[PDB]
Every structure is written in C-alpha cells, then in structure tokens.
Amino acid sequence: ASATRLIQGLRNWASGRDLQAKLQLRYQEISKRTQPPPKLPVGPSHRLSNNYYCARDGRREAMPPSIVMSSQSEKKAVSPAPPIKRWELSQDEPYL
Amino acid sequence: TYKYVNLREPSMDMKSVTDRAAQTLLWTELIRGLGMTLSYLFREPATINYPFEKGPLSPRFRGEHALRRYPSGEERCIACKLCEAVCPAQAITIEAEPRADGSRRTTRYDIDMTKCIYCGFCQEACPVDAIVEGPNFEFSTETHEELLYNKEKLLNNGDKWEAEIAANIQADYLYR
Amino acid sequence: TRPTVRPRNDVAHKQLSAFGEYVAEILPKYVQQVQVSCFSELEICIHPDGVIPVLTFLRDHSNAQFKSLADLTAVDIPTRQNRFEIVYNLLSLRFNSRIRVKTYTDELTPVESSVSVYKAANWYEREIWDMFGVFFANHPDLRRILTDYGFEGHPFRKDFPLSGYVELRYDDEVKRVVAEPVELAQEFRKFDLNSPWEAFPAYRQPPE
Amino acid sequence: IFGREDRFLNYFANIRWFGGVPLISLGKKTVKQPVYIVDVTKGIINAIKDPDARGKTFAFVGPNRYLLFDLVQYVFAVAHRPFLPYPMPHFAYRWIGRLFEISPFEPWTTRDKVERIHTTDRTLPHLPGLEDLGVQATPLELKAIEVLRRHRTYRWLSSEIEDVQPAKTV
Amino acid sequence: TQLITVDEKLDITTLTGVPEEHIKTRKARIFVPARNNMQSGVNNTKKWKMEFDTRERWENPLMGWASTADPLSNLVLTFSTKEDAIAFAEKNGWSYDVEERKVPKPKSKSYGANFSWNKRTRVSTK
Amino acid sequence: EDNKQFFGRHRWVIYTTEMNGKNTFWDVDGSMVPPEWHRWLHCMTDDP
Amino acid sequence: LLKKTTGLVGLAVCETPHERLKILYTKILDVLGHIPKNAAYRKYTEQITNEKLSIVKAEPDVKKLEEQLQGGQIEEVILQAENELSLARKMIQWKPWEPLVEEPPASQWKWPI
Amino acid sequence: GVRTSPTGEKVTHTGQVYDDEDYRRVRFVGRQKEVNENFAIDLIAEQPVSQVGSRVISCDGGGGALGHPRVYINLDKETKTGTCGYCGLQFRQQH
Amino acid sequence: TSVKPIFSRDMNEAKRRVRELYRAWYREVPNTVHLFQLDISVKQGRDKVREMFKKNAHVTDPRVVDLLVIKGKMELEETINVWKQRTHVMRFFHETEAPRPKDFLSKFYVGHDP
Amino acid sequence: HPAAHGVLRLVMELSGEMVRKCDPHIGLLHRGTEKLIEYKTYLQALPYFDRLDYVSMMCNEQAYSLAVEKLLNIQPPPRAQWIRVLFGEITRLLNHIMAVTTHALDIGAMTPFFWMFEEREKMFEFYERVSGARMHAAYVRPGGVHQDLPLGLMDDIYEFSKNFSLRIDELEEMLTNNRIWRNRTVDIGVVTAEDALNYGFSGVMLRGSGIQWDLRKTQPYDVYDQVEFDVPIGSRGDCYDRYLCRVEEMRQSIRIISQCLNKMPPGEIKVDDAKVSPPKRAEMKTSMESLIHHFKLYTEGYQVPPGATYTAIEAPKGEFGVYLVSDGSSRPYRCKIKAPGFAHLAGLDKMSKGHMLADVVAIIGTQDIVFGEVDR
Ligand code: SF4
Ligand code: SF4
Ligand SMILES: [Zn+2]
C-alpha cells in the first residue's frame, strides 16, 4: 500500500479482485513485539483441602485386559458396532 | 457433512455453447492466467535485504547454547546431570569433582553441536537456569571439530550473550 | 476422577466383548484367546495355521466387513520359544470399528502370507522379512525393502545391537565406499532408569 | 611407481596423441621393473613400524623385469590402441623434448623425462627389498587394467582383464 | 501330514548375521541382577538377565570420550526364567555362565526382643 | 528504522567499514551486530 | 430412481436390484444348507441372510430398501452378498467348526513377561 | 587469575594443561587455546559475607524465580560462615 | 519334535536346491564381472563363491539350509539386475581391512582381546 | 532427481516411453527410528515424531501424545485440546500448500510455489512464536502442550486467516480452470473404490474415489466433535478430483481455524497430574514434592501401565497410526509408526498401469509422499 493509484487500478483490473482490502504483506496492524507480562491461572488440583491423590489417580485405575474366551443359546448375530449413519449433504456449498 | 466436489453438469443452450466455443477458439482462461501474473508483477516483493535486514524472530528462539552466571560472577551450574540425562541425542557429557572450596562444580561440560537437535530439553530441565539456548544462529564453522563445544567455549558464549539472554529470560519466564 | 482421569467407555467394551464371543464361537478351530483391553480394544490371539481362514472371514462376513488393513506388525519377545508375534490391525468402514489379530511364530517355521486377502500386505510382511527374518510362505516378491543391499542380519531383532557390525566410509585407494567393522568415537551410554519400587499393583505377577 | 594418479603408465598412454610413440633404438635395450604404489606404501608403513629398519637403505622393485618395447606394447594392448613404433635417434628426441617444456604450466615432457624413461633399472641385490619388510610385490598384470581403463575408447571399455596377452619378461 | 521330523539341535548361528569373532570369543552371563544396596526396593531382581563380558574402552584423542570397538557392549536381554535364557543362549551358539538366584533368608523379627529380661538383645537406646 | 515499510523491512542496519582491525567496507557479516542491538534488529522487542 | 452414477468409481449401476439380491440370497442359503447344523456359522449366516431376504422381499422401492437395509447403496449390498457367497464356499472348503488344532504354550499370551 | 605454564600454554580453572611432551599441542600451533579469564572461585571469593540477625536464613539466589531453589542455612556455628549450596554466598550471625 | 518344513522334506531336496543355486551362481559370475567392470578375474569370483558356499558347510538342519538357499537366491536376484553397486559386489573382497593377528603372541602384543 | 521427493529409486521398465513396470526401491532414508525409540524414554522419543512427516510435525506429535495419553489413562485440559486442534489445522494448511505447490511444480507450474511459500513462511513464524523452532516444534506433549501462547498471537492468526482465502482464490484461478492443467490430470491414475480399499489407501485416496470416510468425523478425537466442517468427495478418482479435494480441505481447514479462534476456553495447558506432566518452574524452586517430581520426570520419566494400543488420527496424508506396546517400564517396548506413504507407494504400481512418463510423475505428485515417514 505504497504504490500510486494508476498501478493499483491496473493491478486490480488485471487480477480481477480487490487486493488493497487484503494485502499479503503485514503492516502496523499486527500485534506489538512487546507485551504486558501474563498471569497464567492454576488448574483444578491446586487446592489445600480435599486434594487426596488416591481419589484422583489416573495410572492406578488401569486394569489388565478383560480376557473373555480362553483355552486355558439362540442369541442374535452381533456386529462390532451399529452401522454408521449415512452422511448428510452440506447446506452451505452443496455443489449440486 | 460432505459436499460433491466436481459433479456439476455443464449446460446445453446455444448461448452457453457459443460462449464455450469462443473460449475454446480464443483462449480466455489463458488470458486470465496472464492477467494474474501481470497483477503479481506490480506488487511489492516480500524480499528482505540480508544481511542488513534480518528476518523477524521471537524471544523463545532456540539457537546456540550458553552457560549463564549468577549476578556475582559465580557460574550457575552445580553439576546435577539432569540435562545429560534428558538430552535425547546424548549430546551432553558431564564430569564433575569437588573443587578447592568444596563446591559442587563441573570439570568437563561438552556439548556436541552436530549431535544436538536444538529442542530445548536441557534449558527447560535445568533447575538453576544454568544452561540456556541463546538466540544466536549465525555460528556456522568451516571445520567439523569446531562444532564440539567444551566448557570454556560455552562459558565464553554465555559471557558474550548474557546481555540478551537475561532479557529473553525476563521476557519469557512467566510462561514457564 | 473427573478432570484428570480419562473417561471410560463401557458401551464399546460390552459391544466388543459380545463381538469377541461371536468370533470365538464362529471359529473354534483357530481362535485361542479373546481379550478386551481397558481402553476398549479387541485382541484375537489365533493359531498361525488359521491366518488365512480367519482374515478372509473378517473381510467377507456381512457382520464384520473389515475391508481395510491398517497396519501389519511384528513384535520380538526373546523370552518365549516362539519369539515372533505377528499382529494384524483391521479397520471396518461399514460398522466403524477396529480389530486386532495376533499370532506367533519362531525363526524357522514359516507362516502363510495374506496377499490373497489384503494386497497392501504385499509390501508390509515383506518389511517384516527385512527386519525380523520371519519367512512368509507363498509370496509374489519377497526381498529386502529398507536395509542396505549387502546388509546381513535383521536389525529389529532384540539380540541385534543398536549400532551394526559394519559401517561405510570412503576410501581413496580403491576409490570406493567400503565397509569396515564399527568403531564408535563415543559409546552409547546405557542408562539404568528402572525404578526399584513396584508401580502398578494391578499387574503384580504371582511369585513362583 | 605406477598407479591411478601416476605419471608413468599415463604418460605412455598419452604419447598416442602426438604420434607413433618413438623410442631410442625401439627401446629394446633398457630394462625396467615398475612397482605398484600400494606395495611402496605398505613398505613405508612397515618401515615406520619396524625398529630394525633404522639406518638401512631399501630398494623397492617389482617382481618381473620387462624391456621397454614390450612394456609399451602391453600398455597399448591393455588400453586397446594401435601401436606403431618407429626408430628415432637419441639426439633428436631431446630436441623435441625441450620443446614441450617451454610451457609456463606443467610441461607434458622434458629432456630429463626422456633420459629417465630410457635409463635401464640397475640391480642391487645387497639392498633389502619389499620381501624383507613382509610385503609381497604385486605384478603389473593385476593392476594394469585398473590403471589403464580410463584411456580406452567406448568400443573396448567393457573388455575383461583376461582378454590380453601378457608381455615377456627377462 | 505336512510335518517333518527334525532331531538335531537348534542352530541359528548362520542366519543371525553376527561375525564369528563375536560368537566364538564371547562369554555371556545369565543371572538375576543384584539389588542396589543404597535403596530398599526389590522390583529390579525379578527377571533373569543375559549380559556380555566387557571389552576394551579407550580414550578419544580429541575430546577424551570413551571410544569403543565392541558392538555388544550395551546388549542386555531379559528373560522370565533360567531355562528360557539358557535356550536362547545355546540357540545362538554362545558360551554361557549361569549364576544361581540368591533369595535372602527369612528372619524371625520380634519387637519384644528389644526389652528382654535375661538376654543380651536389650537395646541400649531407642 | 522506517515504520512506513511493511513488516520485516521496517528496521535495518548499515555496517561500519572498520570492526576489530578488519577492513569490512565490502565483506559485511550478519554476526557483526552486538547483542544489545541484536535484540532490536531481529524484531524481538520494540525498545532499542 | 434410475441413478446416473452410484457415487463410487468403478462400480456400475444395477438396473434390477431386487431380482439380483433375491438370486444371491437364495444361492447363499442353498450353499449354507450343506454345512452341518451344529456349526454356529451356518446358524448365524442363515439368520442374517433370512432377515435380509425378508427385508428385500417386503420393500418394493429402492431408496426405502436402501435406507432400511443399513448398507448404503444397493450396489455395495449386492457386492457384500457376492462376498458372503464366496466366503460360504471357502468355509465349506475349510471347515473351521472342528475343535482347536493345538493348545498354545504356557507362556505364549502372558504380558508383561 | 590465569597462570601460565612453562611451555607458554594457559591453565584453565579446572587445572587442565597439556604436558611438555604431549603431542596434542599440535592442535594449538597456528591457532589459539580458548580459555575463560573470569574464574568463578576468585569472583565468588570477592563477595562479602552478609551479617544477619537470625539463627537460620533462607537463600534463593536473588531474582525469585530466576534463581536457584530456596534453601535454609543454619548459622549456629560462630567459627565458620554458613554457605549456600548453589550460589556460594556466605552468611553469618552477627552475635 | 514334529516341525513344519519350508521347502525340503529331508536333506536330499535341500542339498539339491543348494546344488542348483551353486550352478546358477557359477553361471552368473562372468556376467557380474563383465557388467560391473570389476578388476578381478573370473576364477577369483568363482573361488569367492566357493568360499562363501563352504563357509556354511556345517549346517545339518533342513529349515536353516532352506533359509540359506532363499537368501542366496535373493542375493543372486539382486546381482542379476544391477541393484547392487560396485561397492556392494566388492564388499565380499575385504580390500581395505588389514588382516588381524592370528596366533597367541601377536594377539598378546596388540591388545587385550582373546 | 527433481521429480522424486528427495530419495526414491524407481527402476522402470519402459516400452520406449510408456511404462510397463515400476519398481520403487526405498530405504535410502531408513534411519531405523523404531529401535532407537525403544532405546529412549517417552519424552525423549517425542521429538522423533517431528521428523517422520517433516511437513506435518504437530499432527504426528498429536498422534503420539494421544497414544501415550490413552496408555496412561489421562486426558489433557480443554484449552490444551483446542490449541492442539487449531495448530493441527494450521499444520494441515502447511501440508496441503506443500502438496499442491510441489505437485504443480513437477507438473510444470512453478509460480504458485512462490505464491504460497510466503503463507508457509508466515505459518512457520507462528510455529516459532509458539514453540521456538520453525519446523520441529516439540510442542505437543502427552498431557497437553508444553507452553502457553504468547500474547497477541491470536490477532496475527486472525489476520493471516483473513487474507489466506484470497490467496487460495488466486491459486484456484491459476490452476483449476487451466486447460493444460486439466490435460495432465483429467484421466490420469483412476483408482476404483474396491481397489483403493483393498490396497490400504487412506485419506484423500479414499475421498477422491467417492468413499465417504474421514477420521475426524467417524472416529473423532478431543474437540473435533465440537467444530463444524465439510468433507470434500471426489467422483472420478483422477488426480484432478483429488487436487480439488485438497483445495477444499484447505478451505475447510480455514473454517475450523476460525471456529477454534472464536471458541478458545481459559484454563491451564498441562494436566494437573504432577506425576506425568512436569510442574511449573516457580513451583519447582519452592515446593519439595514439585522438585522431586521434576527430578524424577526429567531423569527417569513416568511409568506407563503395561499393555498395547493402536491410536490413529487423520493426518493430511491420511490415517497416521501408532502401535505402542509398553511393558510397565519408563521406556516403550515397541513403537510402530503406520504412515499412509507406505500403502500409497505400494499402490503406485497399480496406479501407473498403461500410463506415460509424465503421467507417472503426475501420479507420484498427486500422492503427497514424504520418505521420512515411508522409510520410518
Ligand atoms: S537442545 Fe536438546 S538435543 Fe540439544 S543439547 Fe539440549 S537437550 Fe540435547
Ligand atoms: S541441568 Fe543445569 S545444573 Fe544440572 S548439570 Fe545441566 S547445566 Fe548443570
Ligand atoms: Zn543461594
């Protein structure tokens, strides 16, 4: 955004779009290189009361895999999951 | 949740067929591509003038390694060997012994820059902020063994870039 | 256990257990073990002699339709007499699921190739021949795919060391890249990082 | 010493540009026994490692003694080039030998190169050789093809080592 | 029947690609590792290990690093039982030394023994 | 500095012709910048 | 409906889905008739194929049949029927309803070691 | 405080110096040996001892989160001064 | 003790396959000498083939020798087409490695290795 | 060769110019990654995944982190999940720009390469601002992310995502409507749906063949079920439909980036389990348990419960899978990386039947293949 108006007009005609609204070169609109210092918050476990680790352990709740059939009725046939629902068409740009 | 890309059916009427035939015989979209190149001819190029015009960076940048000091002259490292235990490429070699005043200080601190992957595990596993990854990246050498930094080179780099390393740490220490 | 512990899926666990019982009762000749992990994954440990009659079933049955072969893997565990564990990962797009089929073999006994089931395995098990030495019988083109042309030995075996027995360097007398016995300038420092205290009591093996 | 980067076999293979490789009385009076470069290098290495090699004066020679005419014939037979020698006197050889030395760059030949090429190799059996340093002398027939494969044309570039007649030694 | 009868011992020495120098000169050791006495945990003494003898390690001329020429310097193998380790050892043609597992002897602890009446097990202080 | 130019071109340096006893009239170097100016030149801060 | 394309590449439009599906399902049932009754594969395949054949017979339309068969397009349903028939022939050839071939070793499926 | 070896080579703060008969000095001829002239022991010996009026003291090295972990130093002994493990600063009870 | 065979039911079929592989290698050697432009004779290549075949001469297991035959056929296929370079073919001739000490005295002189 | 992606050896039997057989010899970039992964801890093997797909770094980071978190029975905080999804979509834009521009470069259009590498440089600047390294960030870790965003990054991402639509419009004006571009891609490399399914193809290879399958819609992960986006579907299986699918995926990635920018929640960045994620550096220098956990995490590492799992994500090249087997120690017993490039290069032989030399190079380009992930 420093070129003269003739060059901007010829450029806009040749491109077919408006390039002055969206320039690929950054300018003073970007964020400043210096910022105020932040204050990051704490998580949900930063408490002084009722914070026992045995009640919120993640690794210790893992279990060995549940072995079902091992070699040491008229039930229905079963799939691994119900069949996936049919995908709906896009309502924004259906291209149809 | 899906769209039918490239399934549009072309028209059939005489005006659109004449338009398509005119585009075929007169090459309209080739002129469109020529016009787009001509538009890109008249823009400001994004080329910076190195080495007078350095590219933008961040205070978190990882480059050459350095050893810091306390603000009294004492070197910060107390030879805890966390950095060589967390270095994934085993670039850090540490050997330590008690010195004259009984302080736990290093005797050998070697970083192989050709082994180092520049990921900042050592600068984030250091409990006393001793080893840091400075912002310098223009340190290419002409010989392989010059990229084998001992303790003296790292201490000299720390004394050379302390005035920048301290400012970068002061900028970025609240995110850690 | 709300904000940190990963949530548990029980419907998928029940469905996978039911499908594991279904597969085990359909094929009692080859299926040895069926297990469901805590994060809802199904493992079917089968006999090697049923590598082909199981997989095609999962490829062709109307209730399985595992049309995709995601990954073919091999695991080297030297503590067993059948040290090699070949694992197939199958993806079913119709029923939106994943299954795992495991089998065992040693160095000498060949196992039947599944190129007649999934053609992607045409490369995949070939990779195993490059890195574990498991010979896949009835293969179209079985040769090395990742290692050097004159390379000897299978690198991903656990008894194979990290650095190889040879290294390449340029020699100006013979004007050639030559292979020499390895001499590391700095040894790979082996670290003993195992904690001597028991971590998970749920996996405590009973003593002898 | 002959090798890949030498100036002994390559010189003989490069005489063919000028003409028909002239010699002094066809080169049938001078006897030469060239030696491989790797044999000399191994001899030097062993002499460095030998505590009993200090103070000696070794003489490194090849295994077979050839005449110059048959040596040039074998060189041109390995290189697969036509070999048409012709008599040329000794005094006229230095006259054109000094013509090539007036170049400011590296000269192609000098009078001294002509003198040393047409000088027969003396035999000194009293001086210890490569065998006393534990080095076996590699014959010219094993490495001549490796040296001279660069000078062949495209027509005979793919011919093997054994498709040649070895020269007669004395 | 698609099965054959093989009566000879196992031999995968010619298929593993190891050179003979690191086959006929190596001496493997099969052992339960010793507990670290600075600690008190016993979880590191559960599985048998196969280790190899230590070869020459010298100093680098440039940096003083520990240069080596032994490819099997950092090869530790883990086995559940002694028989599996010995079968893996004789399968690959390695001469081996087997060390027996040293289970500690159980004691007879007694807190009252610190307060005996006519014995020498009285604690001087506590 | 000239902030009217686009980002990446708003700060530049003209190197000297004499640095540590070397004639650097032509052979300019990117490592000839002191660190206190290396912070500002590489756009790491807004304060010189 | 007379669909111009099925939406997938290399899959042709089937003009008569009902008759082809009936033919394939009847052929599958006739092939599964040879398998012994105590094999669970015969019972399960017969159950699902009889349910699918009742669905195909009951619905005269194409879109409603596709939406209530839960298989997507009718062409992949026909392809799945063909694959089921091929599996039925291979299962007759294999006979996997026999007991287990061999017990595994005692330390074969134990993790961790 | 860098001393000079009789060969002319400089001695580092560790005390490393190549011997007269050591061949590895060929790496230094025509070039320089990189040593640091700011010795940490001499610079920490110039720091004055801080007099405080408490039995125990807390040291973090200064700067808060930019220093070492905070430790506690006892100053019961009056013959010697309690020294920080990380920073090397020494404190003394003034009584 | 009943195992699954790979190719040979007994030792006879396995040694027949070994014989056929040796015939194929002996026929193939002059072509690899000619195409790779090696500086060695055909007899040297054939004696190297014989040495590599006699290196594994102590194998008395049908499955192991079947795998050896498979690997030899793989190497033969890799050298019929030019997939190996000159370096890969010449790596069978250790031209750059000095011969190690053999007797006890020289091994005692040069290092601690047995 | 400028056509091959760095290291690739096609031995091609040609009938003059028409290809009769293609033999892709690979392994020139085999580094032996998944043995050294077994020889290192989990945090030490985390930067290994930045170099498999060296244009999809945080996607592989997210795959490895999801596998380790599944084995650890923990989950990251919501802000970490939103950051991971936003940077995954930025990474998808990076990979798709690389794929389309390099493919057009081997076809012959070298100008959109220079047009889109400026946007690539801007995204690399975002990477450097958020992690400190331009490509190999090592940012996504098991338990969330390593560090929080620097202030003012969201506005820069917003401006870049504002102008990137015009950049894509310029590229599509250049390449899509061109007749010469069509003549190289209209009837080249047609793959049927069944042959794509049976060859282990995943991602765009399926989606260009009309197969409706996306792992962010069918088997979604952390917060991909909370965003809204469309899935492009091809019709003919040629290179043209898949190029159009990639461009539409760039558009939908921009849509997801905007949705993630407008919906970022406050909170932390790591899990609060200090036995898995390291504590804050201010807490390490003050508390005792924090220092002990910092020591034992940066020396030994956390202990993963024993077991095996297979975690797959939708990388821009397709299904990216990790098979992780842990024996209860602090180092992985086995870690196999399933990359789509292996299956795509395996199917390249059937892809290039009856085609020409330039058709073979177009087929090579239309599969976005990097060989670090192919050779592992
Ligand atoms: S940056 Fe990473 S690779 Fe380099 S020395 Fe530090 S820990 Fe090692
Ligand atoms: S982590 Fe820091 S204090 Fe510890 S040894 Fe390394 S540099 Fe020294
Ligand atoms: Zn202090």
Name the descriptors:
part of a larger assembly; 10 chains; C: 208 residues; alpha/beta; five-stranded mixed β-sheet; two-stranded parallel sheet; 3 helices; 9 strands; 18% helix; J: 376 residues; alpha+beta; three-stranded antiparallel β-sheet; two-stranded antiparallel ribbon; binds iron/sulfur cluster; binds zinc ion; proton transport; Complex I
Overview of this protein structure:
This is part of a larger assembly, with ten protein chains of ten kinds. Chain C is built from three helices and nine strands, in the order H-E-E-H-E-E-E-E-H-E-E-E. Chain C is α/β, with parallel strands linked by helices and 208 residues long. In chain C, strand 3 (68-76) and strand 4 form a beta hairpin. Chain D has 170 residues and is mostly helical. Chain D is built from six helices and two strands. Chain D has helices at 9-14, 37-49, 68-78, 90-97, 111-117, 140-148, and strands at 31-32, 66-67. Chain D has a two-stranded antiparallel sheet with strand order 1-2. The longest helix of chain D has 13 residues, at 37-49. Chain H is elongated. In chain H, strand 4 and strand 5 form a beta hairpin. Helices cover 61% and strands 2% of the residues of chain I. In chain I, helix 1 (11-35) packs antiparallel against helix 2 (42-55) and helix 1 (11-35) packs parallel to helix 3. The N and C termini of chain I lie far apart (38 Å). The chains are: A little secondary structure (96), B alpha+beta (176), C alpha/beta (208), D mainly alpha (170), E alpha+beta (126), F little secondary structure (48), G mainly alpha (113), H mainly beta (95), I mainly alpha (114), J alpha+beta (376). The A-J interface holds A 15-17, 19, 22-24, 26, 29-32, 35-36, 38, 40-46, 56, 58-59, 61-62, 65, 84, 87, 90, 92-93 and J 72-74, 77, 118-119, 148, 150-153, 155-156, 159, 162-163, 165-167, 169-170, 173, 212, 217-218, 230-231, 266-273, 275-276, 302-305, 307. The structure holds iron/sulfur cluster (2 copies) and zinc ion. One iron/sulfur cluster (SF4) is lined by residues 77-83, 94, 125-126, 128, 130-131 of chain B. Chain I: Mammalian complex I is composed of 45 different subunits.
